[PDB]
Symmetry: D2
Subunit: 257 residues, 4 copies
């Protein structure tokens, strides 16, 4: 069996065992993929977190704002997977916005320097990651990013909403590039998942609306249905979708109430 | 293995071996599913087409406009799959619109009697298949219909575009009903496929504009599609459909998956 | 001054003085438009209602399901407005769904005859009115229908939601036909208005608030679209809902 | 009247007489509006240009990346219009992307410094103009910004497409802030118009085919040489005739975005 049997897949964004990335990595492994992980800040500790996966996997450092990590990244990856092998899969699960662009902070009070850093990490970095990895990607491959539906405004999400609108744009253009390698590019738009990144009456009402609107419910504490949706895109069962967004959100975005 | 291993699935809409429904059925059978097939009008002929599938599947008659067939459907289905068994999957791959409502024929000249029948078969029937069959679906099941992106108008497709807009709306409401059974409901928005459904409309426009426009409309897909589109090849859409029938999209209902090469995400 | 100064405008859909169409007509007449009105079933009663408007307007019978009514409409309208005169504007503010397709009746329990009737009246008729009327419209003219955002499923609205999705599709093909005459076609997606038809936290989502008792903001939007001030928008939807549709909460 | 009779409206973005801001301001003055104009770099020649408007109007300098222009903006406006007088309208008609993110330059080779610059100016400044000007806006006012439908990717527009997507998100959050003041915020997504910014973005031949393409898809047709249907739409949203719409987008594109072909 194995939905992802034989596939070599890069997975960024594990920071804890609650990380959406951690769960994509797990399910991908249960499904036959061989993975290469990347980690941003506390490599020593991410290494421990990743020790908890069903199988071992190289772990490389990637600070998505660091030019040098980006230039060296294709090279380091081939070393890890064995020269003469390419990636079949890439998962961008990275995101950041300064606190001032975030929750209770006045929307107008977030300075551009702060807005720019968050756009850098959350939006521009999807393109730079694709730039780095596409030369080492096989035909029939799949790049997947993580998205939270920015098509309407809402409390707290603030300038991250903006960064996700930009990310959706970037996705459409990356797909144009990836098409040349016979590679798909897509976003999974997830419901709220109880994560290190997630984290008063505003937020609660906002997050309660998923389970309510979703004809099949939504569980903020279960990352697996979103993980499976990501693998679905990494697999050969969505061969004809690109520059697109799959909604893994219990159907919530299709229901007014 | 078997993406659809052990799953029992109803596939409607086979009329020729080049039907999207034919190719959904076959990929499904290749992936371990056991099928029930429904066919509309020329059953003797359809059985001959369905004989060409790699595995046995029983073939029931279903005129979507016939209240008795829909009434009898659930029972006839359970007869075929054995009592105490239920479907995990249902494929609606059916569509009709009179000549009047399509192609070279002026948009304003389609009488409502014709549009009505088009929308009956093409949009309403989605809800009525769900009504008939949800009673015999397992939790975690999946209903899947076929769409052609109606978000923008376009030459020739005319009143079928109006049908598909309605379908998309029915799909969101069907998702609400189905959610109570642990069942998903989604559509696949396929790019254009060399099926036989567009044929007479194509033949009629041969000399005129929108014979040309249809060709240009059609050929724009591969142009926009950042990974290309190939109208002779139905298997990328059959796969996407199976993907939705499987357990690998457990969090999506009321929704539309575009199997179109990325075409709808690009302006050119 | 007078946004609609000199325009000649057909308004359908008045049944009471709470009707969106009544308010569209009042505002339009306040802005210098001269109107032709159409009424469905209760014409003596409707004349009673339309006497309450600032000015006079011929009142013509139109059952949108009656085909001989459609065939005669344009001739009847040209007698109303006089020889050599044309319509600058058409307002379609008609809708209907059997109770079977709505509210509390289980979605699945609506017979197709009921659904098909609601669709004929609420969506196809936008096309047949456009058909009947475009040959007597001026270039620069404007056809406007009423919408309620069916992009997402919702309680109660049920099969009207479907009829509206249909309507949105028809508008876009109506726009292709209308452009052949230099005419625009659009829809106004309104927030809920306490109307005959009939009609909680819309005011919530709306950044500028929403008053279900106030038809005027929507009537005004319809008028902006009949005017020369949106000369480059067609096959489109303008949202007169206080911005509600652009906010998750 | 005078669609805009007696209204005080600020218009940014005039650089030449083929500018979309130039036509908005001209139409606005034709409709009875009293204006205050802002200009970016070439202020002396912006003054020559605005001398070509139907009525004279105060010109202020505003570089949207200059925090002190923004801090003083309100004061200089009130002083331009007289104390105790507030604005009814704000028009954001400004954008920039460095060439690296902007045509045949590969999409992947745009340095984030260049992209961040274009986003600052094309998207972020919409919010920063609202923050500065809302404290001097009357209830019932309108803020309007300029858009180009970025819902689908396309050749040439590149990272500017990404900026517009962000703008659209920004617009909906400004609507939230503006609402508290009784003020609307909305974008006009226009079809292509031949402005300094269009050139650029060979040259002549791609334009003729864009002119042709857009015109065909548009049910009411499209003339890239004529800004006045777009200026009118902006005046419509500045007027009292669109009182129930914010956080939104009005397409003045001849309907082209509604048609596949
Ligand atoms: N959790 C949710 O409800 C939610 C919903 C939809 C989408 N998303 C998106 O999913 C993705 C993963 O977030 P999460 O919810 O798993 O939170 P998380 O805390 O688990 O992950 C955030 C990750 O981003 C990484 N990161 C930050 N800066 C980086 C940089 N400079 N270079 C490389 N990596 C960097 C961090 O290391 C961390 O692994 C994000 O893109 C997020 O916006 C989250
Ligand atoms: N072919 C394409 O390019 C394409 C693209 C997008 C979507 N679609 C959709 O795919 C679906 C299948 O179409 P296709 O292209 O395979 O054409 P097709 O001719 O193979 O299928 C149409 C099917 O609908 C059936 N049908 C008609 N009336 C019926 C009724 N009264 N009761 C039961 N069945 C009835 C026909 O018997 C036929 O099998 C349709 O919904 C169509 O709109 C097709
Ligand atoms: N009021 C709201 O909250 C709301 C919101 C969005 C859209 N709309 C739409 O606006 C339009 C007007 O509805 P309303 O709210 O003014 O209520 P209304 O009851 O005043 O309007 C409905 C009109 O449709 C007419 N009609 C029904 N069948 C007809 C037929 N066969 N031929 C000709 N006319 C026929 C009725 O006579 C009536 O005048 C409808 O399209 C409705 O869907 C209403
Ligand atoms: N021309 C078109 O086809 C088209 C189509 C849709 C939308 N738009 C949008 O319309 C707006 C106006 O563009 P245009 O086409 O009229 O071109 P334009 O060149 O005439 O005007 C663009 C303006 O942006 C200004 N600008 C750049 N950086 C600035 C800054 N730091 N501070 C203040 N102003 C700055 C320039 O001075 C110029 O006045 C832009 O936002 C553009 O994206 C243009
Ligand atoms: O993008 C996200 C979206 C959610 C869902 C959510 C949104 C708003 C209210 C409630 C829940 C949860 C986490 C998300 O990721 C991040 C958020 C902030 C930062 Cl700094 C970094 C990341 Cl990675
Ligand atoms: O829904 C469809 C969509 C297409 C794609 C296409 C559209 C227009 C031009 C070229 C190709 C092709 C066929 C489709 O099905 C039908 C069409 C008509 C009838 Cl009567 C019945 C069916 Cl099933
Ligand atoms: O389209 C409409 C929309 C509303 C606003 C509303 C929507 C949903 C929940 C609550 C209120 C109100 C009335 C509407 O028109 C009709 C509805 C039914 C019938 Cl039979 C006829 C018409 Cl004309
Ligand atoms: O936003 C725009 C959109 C267009 C329409 C267009 C798109 C693509 C091909 C042809 C025309 C034209 C000009 C636009 O403004 C700018 C573009 C670039 C720069 Cl640096 C600055 C501005 Cl202000």
């Amino acid at each position: 069996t194995g939905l992802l049997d034989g596939k070599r897949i890069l997975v960024s964004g594990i920071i804890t065992d609650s990380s959406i990335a951690f769960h994509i990595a797990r399910v991908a492994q249960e499904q036959g993929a061989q993975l290469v992980l990347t980690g941003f800040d506390r490599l020593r500790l991410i290494q421990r977190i990743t020790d908890r996966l069903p199988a071992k996997a190289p772990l490389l450092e990637l600070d998505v704002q660091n030019e040098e990590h980006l230039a060296s990244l294709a090279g380091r990856v081939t070393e890890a997977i064995g020269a003469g092998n390419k990636l079949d899969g890439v998962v961008h699960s990275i995101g950041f916005m300064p606190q001032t662009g975030m929750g209770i902070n006045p929307f107008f009070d977030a300075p551009y320097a702060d807005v720019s850093k968050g756009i850098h990490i959350s939006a521009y970095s999807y393109a730079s990651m694709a730039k780095a990895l596409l030369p080492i990607m096989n035909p029939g491959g799949s790049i997947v990013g993580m998205d939270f539906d920015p098509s309407r405004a809402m409390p707290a999400y603030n300038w991250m909403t903006v960064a996700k609108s930009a990310l959706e744009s970037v996705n459409r253009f990356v797909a144009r590039e990836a098409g040349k390698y016979g590679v798909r590019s897509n976003l999974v738009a997830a419901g709220p998942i109880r994560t290190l990144a997630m984290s008063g009456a505003q937020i609660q009402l906002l997050e309660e609306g998923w389970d309510q609107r979703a004809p099949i419910g939504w569980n903020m504490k279960d990352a697996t249905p979103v993980a499976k949706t990501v693998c679905a895109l990494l697999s050969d069962w969505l061969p004809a979708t690109t520059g697109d967004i799959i909604y893994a959100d219990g159907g919530a975005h299709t229901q007014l109430l």
